[PDB]
Write a protein that binds this DNA or RNA. Structure first.
Ligand SMILES: Nc1ncnc2c1ncn2[C@@H]1O[C@H](COP(=O)(O)OP(=O)(O)NP(=O)(O)O)[C@@H](O)[C@H]1O
Ligand SMILES: Nc1ncnc2c1ncn2[C@@H]1O[C@H](COP(=O)(O)OP(=O)(O)NP(=O)(O)O)[C@@H](O)[C@H]1O
Ligand SMILES: Nc1ncnc2c1ncn2[C@@H]1O[C@H](COP(=O)(O)OP(=O)(O)NP(=O)(O)O)[C@@H](O)[C@H]1O
Ligand SMILES: Nc1ncnc2c1ncn2[C@@H]1O[C@H](COP(=O)(O)OP(=O)(O)NP(=O)(O)O)[C@@H](O)[C@H]1O
Ligand SMILES: [Mg+2]
Ligand SMILES: [Mg+2]
Ligand SMILES: [Zn+2]
Ligand SMILES: [Zn+2]
Lengths: 743, 743
DNA sequence: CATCGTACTGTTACGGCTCCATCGATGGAGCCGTAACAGCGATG
DNA sequence: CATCGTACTGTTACGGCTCCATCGATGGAGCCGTAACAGCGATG
């Protein structure tokens, strides 16, 4: 009935007790960094997996592996759990859609089980001959030589001595006793005539005996000579007329149609019902989410973000179970509203089978389509990790201590601008863009305003922007050695002086990385430290103060601090001599131990450091430490670190900003902060282009370039273009339909 | 609170609903073949394992594997389950006790984690030098050449050009500027003097700088020359003074003592607490059950039945968990009463940790030491598979519908004989028996009476009987080519004419085996069928009617009948022509489809077949089919088939019967049947020797030869010898102590 | 001590069948640190 | 058209570190089927 958790203390959680209803659609909600992932994935799934694994052999435990033991007193009401991680995976080039979805294994099993390559037994042969009409004259032959050249005299003598008298050679029956002649260089088909029977009921015994002796003499080969009829031969991989490659070269929808109407007998059904059911469920889920155009032979590395996310989901939740907790960590990454609604319908269908759904989400549609909501807060980092509200959507909305309820209820909102900026005659015209699935379209992107590129997941917006416009602009301005996509020409590059791009790619997590190193400010800090008088006296350089460089780092901990915390250097990753150069009475370890807000006051005089620290504060990461390990960063925190890294660069007043879905893992407040930053950048005279699926960002855009009307080969055309109201007035545009209810 | 099972239909179960209390000692009870194993192992454990496995990846599912899906409507209250199978396992010769118990892996991890092979950092070297007293004169050296021969002129010139002036050669300090001479064929130790410091507080910076430059110049080698003191060298697997082989060559008790008082610092404890805890738990369980004499390097194939069973238990239940169902299928195989009591104490300790115990048992001590009892019956095979009684021990005893309650309450019992047979001057004297752990004892075994060999598990009774007496008797009488054990001589063999032995070994389960083939009566049946007139007319032989021979078996099913049941031959494993030779109007398939009681009436005229069928009926297997697959036979049924096979042989009135614990897997009624058969054999003038642990069998024996007083190196001596009352009068004999409460 | 009588029982080798125990590495991608390269004004 | 000014910013190649995806076989033992081998009586 309930999953009772008491005394949860993982990461930033503070002894929180929660009762999660079972067999319900439960949504975990909070600010970015509050501890939803630590509450669900790091506690509930971790404990369930640990309990299941601990009852296994040492070989199995080593092969599978278990996560770290959570700091929870006791958790009850558990069951088998299937979890989808928040982090996106990068796949090998050899990987395939069918291999990732695991339909290839089921296809291989089906082909090895029921794939038809004639193997007949004695009884089957007897029945086959019995199928003939009564009165037909037949002869049973035992071919000893089939396609060979030789004198064949000893063999004939042995056959005659065995007892057989009738032998047919070259299709003519001759007596073995009478001498015969045959060319040694000419192929001959020597066959022994065993019996000359008649077809009538009641000769089963004699026919079976003759077939048995023929099979014994000819080693499993029987030839039935039908007098006046066509001769037949009896001896001891495609399904439905399609090979494995042929069935793997079809679309998902066509494969589902083929597997839905294939003709199978009772034996084949009883043999492969389970495999057919698994394949049907997987293909049905793939068609339901919207991936009915991809072929099963497509490489998984070439898929877009939304398609990759949907295939990752289909790998785990493709075939539903019963009595299993499903933990999904933001399954709506890079998905349009339509795709999110289809996923929600699939999730409700999965829950209706008798499953518990524990979905961590930042979306509002999931919030409105949820039975129960658990709110965490009231802040992020050390200021969160405790439940601030609980109940249904309405109770959360009426709750004054929940920020997400405040944003849902309209108390806090992102204002829709009263007046939108208009283009001033400067445009970027892309002519003949035919990259990937684009259909030779001409797109004009206004300069100096806020532009949003909208469209369904897979419609061709990343390929239009990142693969063509950004690459051409980089080659023109930054002199990068990258080749752009397929296009005729781009006009209007002379109006720009720089390009800054944030891509839609995973962020690498390493123990050698932290916000300071990622943003590039640690280099300035190290140079400042190495420029002091003490470092000059001791002959130190910038690499001495790096914990990844074996010049001043502690060798006991190998620069990591933990081997169990280190004791010689106290886990600070620096030896005692390095931790003596002090800038403003503070060494490098305490500088790394500062928060962003503290570093704002400490480094308020150095402009290069101050700009980056101010950007990190602006994206809302003021609570984070400058030296926190990147492996211990959340998805939203890592995304915001990347955003600050790219947005803390110099602006000349004519630069172009390109962002590829920068909202991933961001709560509605972080979206507000990002929107404010972007609009300030635009007001400074720059131009910002955002490939976005969020309606809160979209409704504040001055220009919108919709793409579609579908994904894959069904997309690649501009379906709407103009201000958000004009796009909303378009009937056939999905983004306009969803904007009509927002504006 | 409860594990609710509804609609269980696995094997012979008939829609039984059971509520098993949780966190209790629950014992499953019934006749042999009633369906206890199918109820527990084939339903509850199977469903739990299937549910846990289905939530895993395809790779993991293939690597681990899952059992067949049970025919159960729904089962609730499940949790992770650890199960010990009833079947005994045969291990490879290379296997070891430590490897089987899985202590070897933990030992390897401990040695790889904390095993000490001097790796020092700069700070550690500085601290070590600072440990010296104040005022001491030291010199830092960088040895560039250590044990080499050469002219060494370019190296000296390079060192001088670098800046260093002081170089010590052959232990004498010389100036690099002044010319020096050295033999090219003589080894020289060239060392560069870097600094000549003093020991006082406040020289940490200079000392660290000198150590760093010395380490850089000499590539991680530092030599500290203490003036007036012993020189020391600083540079950049045994635990507790014992190697891995040394710690693996100790006894289990000594290893536990060593691991209980080993000296470890805080770092080592924080590193390997989990490994130490696992090793301590495993060794504590091994000592508790009674295996405190085996060394961890002993081969597992040389262990006795009880030791092997205890080690198999310790593999799974050695380290306890919490909230886990433990399913044990007869864990008291080949164990004395004392060992069974120790195992019961361990099981109660395991249950007190918060675990559910589901123990299938035939013993009475387990019944009396159980919180809840579930009784199945009222018979075996198709006559059982339904719950006939339920409740505590007293309720079961008062229940009139439970046979086990009847035997517990004394309503049904095995009578103790009023008068015991006395030896008639014929004895079998074994002189100088020193096989295995025997201590050169002389044992006299009376002839013509019922003799029982008793003793603790491991005391040396199987080695005394099977390895010496049976092998010598076989070599003397049956002319077998087997070498006996270590003994001087055996007297009295001239009083015997034959020997029949039932060994304590596993029974192989193959699809090609059934009771008819195992007992050897199928050969007679096949000969009878091949001797008919129809088979003579069709030229058939005895191998034609064998389903394992490719002469008359169906090739579609390959003689197995199932490929999904076969359709051409209807799964009968014979082709249509073979199923036409009828003996008394019945072919081979219906003969194989007979029960033992049916075959008693059908074959009542053929004496050779009738004797074997009558023996199979006598051991109580009248409900079984003559052709039931051996893979679908229970442990008790297989044991009884083996017993009937060996006891259905000719008796000359002077044969010797040797049985090595024939009670394994037998309920108290099957024991009564076996005791009656054995006593009839003895009354026919034969002699029976039984190595038994069952008190019901023991109390009916005319003579008893106790062995002990312990197992392993602590046993091998006769502690009692005489009638059961005389043995009961012995104070130091465990068997006498347990018999005192029975007689 | 020789002769006769309507195809005899029990126990072992040997080949074929089947079940069960026992046992990380390589390439790809992202990131950090370091080296390398390009890019107002006044007077005679 | 030449001259002067108290160690300058931003973006790319390249090597080293680290995380993550992806992928049955062999010997031993037991059993079955087949071939192989050993083992009263009366008369002259
Ligand atoms: N291993 C760790 N040790 C200590 N703190 C951690 C660790 N991992 C994460 N944190 C911090 O704990 C807080 C909560 O992290 P997490 O539970 O991942 O957040 P989240 O709610 O899933 N946020 P997001 O996914 O961005 O919406 C953040 O401040 C993290 O930086
Ligand atoms: N390298 C490639 N080769 C072939 N087809 C590709 C390749 N990359 C992408 N595609 C396809 O091109 C179409 C558009 O993908 P893309 O333009 O990258 O995505 P998008 O429209 O931005 N969608 P998303 O990022 O998920 O919201 C999809 O059908 C992709 O599968
Ligand atoms: N796979 C099977 N299919 C059909 N019947 C089976 C199968 N396995 C076992 N049986 C029969 O089902 C009955 C119960 O078997 P099982 O559940 O193993 O008994 P059990 O109570 O554990 N007996 P035992 O272990 O000897 O004390 C017996 O008559 C078996 O012969
Ligand atoms: N091949 C062997 N080499 C060395 N020791 C052995 C061997 N076989 C058995 N032992 C040991 O000899 C002792 C007696 O074993 P054994 O006589 O076979 O058992 P048992 O007394 O009949 N006990 P059990 O059958 O379990 O009730 C035990 O300590 C065994 O570990
Ligand atoms: Mg998260
Ligand atoms: Mg059983
Ligand atoms: Zn250290
Ligand atoms: Zn068949």
């Amino acid at each position: 009935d309930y999953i009772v958790v008491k005394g949860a203390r993982e990461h930033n959680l503070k002894n929180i007790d929660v009762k999660i209803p079972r067999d319900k659609f439960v949504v975990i909600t909070g600010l970015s960094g509050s501890g939803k992932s630590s509450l669900a994935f790091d506690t509930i799934y971790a404990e369930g997996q640990r309990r299941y694994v601990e009852s296994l052999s040492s070989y199995a435990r080593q092969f599978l592996g278990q996560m770290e033991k959570p700091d929870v007193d006791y958790i009850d009401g558990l069951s088998p759990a299937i979890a989808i991680d928040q982090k996106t995976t990068s796949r090998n080039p050899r990987s395939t859609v069918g291999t990732v979805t695991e339909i290839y294994d089921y296809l291989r099993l089906l082909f090895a089980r029921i794939g038809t390559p004639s193997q007949q037994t004695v009884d089957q042969m007897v029945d086959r001959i019995m199928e003939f009409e009564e009165g037909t004259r037949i002869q049973l032959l035992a071919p000893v030589v089939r396609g060979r050249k030789g004198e064949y005299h000893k063999l004939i003598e042995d056959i005659k001595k065995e007892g057989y008298v009738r032998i047919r050679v070259d299709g003519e029956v001759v007596d073995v006793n009478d001498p015969v002649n045959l060319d040694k260089n000419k192929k001959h088909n020597i066959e022994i005539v065993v019996d000359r029977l008649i077809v009538r009921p009641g000769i089963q015994k004699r026919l079976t005996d003759s077939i048995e002796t023929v099979l014994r003499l000819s080693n499993g080969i029987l030839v039935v000579d039908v007098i006046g009829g066509k001769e037949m031969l009896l001896s001891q991989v495609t399904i439905g007329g399609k090979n494995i490659y042929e069935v793997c070269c079809l679309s998902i929808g066509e494969a589902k149609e083929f597997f839905a109407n294939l003709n199978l007998t009772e034996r084949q059904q009883l043999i492969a019902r389970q495999i057919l059911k698994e394949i049907n469920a997987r293909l049905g889920f793939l068609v339901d989410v919207g991936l009915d155009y991809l072929t099963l032979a497509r490489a998984a590395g070439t898929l877009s973000g939304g398609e990759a996310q949907r295939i990752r989901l289909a790998t785990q939740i493709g075939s539903g179970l019963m009595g299993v907790i499903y933990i999904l960590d933001e399954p709506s990454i890079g998905l349009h509203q339509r795709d999110n609604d289809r996923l929600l319908r699939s999730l409700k269908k999965l829950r209706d089978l008798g499953n518990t759904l524990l979905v961590v989400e930042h979306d509002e549609d999931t919030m409105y389509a949820s039975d129960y909501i658990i709110d965490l807060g009231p802040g992020a980092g050390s200021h969160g990790g405790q439940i601030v509200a609980e109940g249904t959507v309405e109770e959360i909305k009426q709750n004054p201590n929940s920020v997400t309820g405040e944003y849902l209820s309209g108390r806090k909102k992102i204002e829709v601008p009263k007046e939108r900026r208009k283009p001033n005659g400067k445009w970027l015209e892309i002519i003949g863009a035919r990259e990937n699935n684009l259909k030779n379209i001409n797109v004009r992107i206004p300069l100096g305003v806020f532009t949003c590129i909208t469209g369904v997941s897979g419609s061709g917006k990343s390929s239009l922007i990142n693969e063509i416009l950004y690459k051409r602009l980089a080659a023109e301005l930054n002199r990068a050695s990258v080749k752009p996509g397929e296009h005729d020409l781009i006009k209007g590059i002379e109006y720009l002086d720089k390009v800054i791009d944030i891509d839609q790619s995973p962020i690498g997590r390493t123990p050698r990385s932290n916000p300071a190193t990622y943003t590039g400010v640690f280099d300035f800090i190290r140079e400042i430290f190495a420029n002091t008088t003490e470092a000059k006296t001791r002959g130190y350089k910038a690499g001495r103060f790096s914990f990844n460089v074996k010049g001043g780092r502690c060798e006991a901990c190998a620069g990591d601090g933990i081997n169990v915390p280190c004791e010689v250097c106290k886990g600070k990753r620096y030896n005692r001599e390095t931790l003596e150069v002090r800038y403003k009475g503070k060494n490098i370890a305490e500088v790394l131990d500062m928060t962003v807000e503290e570093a704002l006051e400490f480094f308020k005089n150095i402009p290069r450091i101050h700009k980056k620290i101010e950007t990190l504060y602006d994206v809302g990461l003021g609570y984070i430490k400058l030296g926190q390990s990147s492996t211990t960063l959340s998805g939203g925190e890592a995304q915001r670190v990347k955003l600050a890294t790219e947005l803390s660069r110099k602006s000349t007043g004519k630069t172009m900003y390109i962002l590829d879905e920068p909202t991933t893992g961001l709560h509605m407040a972080d979206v507000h902060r990002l929107v404010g930053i972007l609009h300030r950048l635009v007001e400074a005279g720059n131009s910002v282009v955002v490939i976005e699926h969020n309606l809160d960002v979209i409704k504040t855009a001055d220009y919108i370039i919709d793409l579609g009307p579908e994904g894959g080969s069904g997309g690649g055309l501009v379906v709407a273009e103009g201000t958000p109201e004009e796009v909303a007035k378009v009937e056939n545009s999905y983004t306009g339909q969803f904007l009509k209810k927002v504006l």
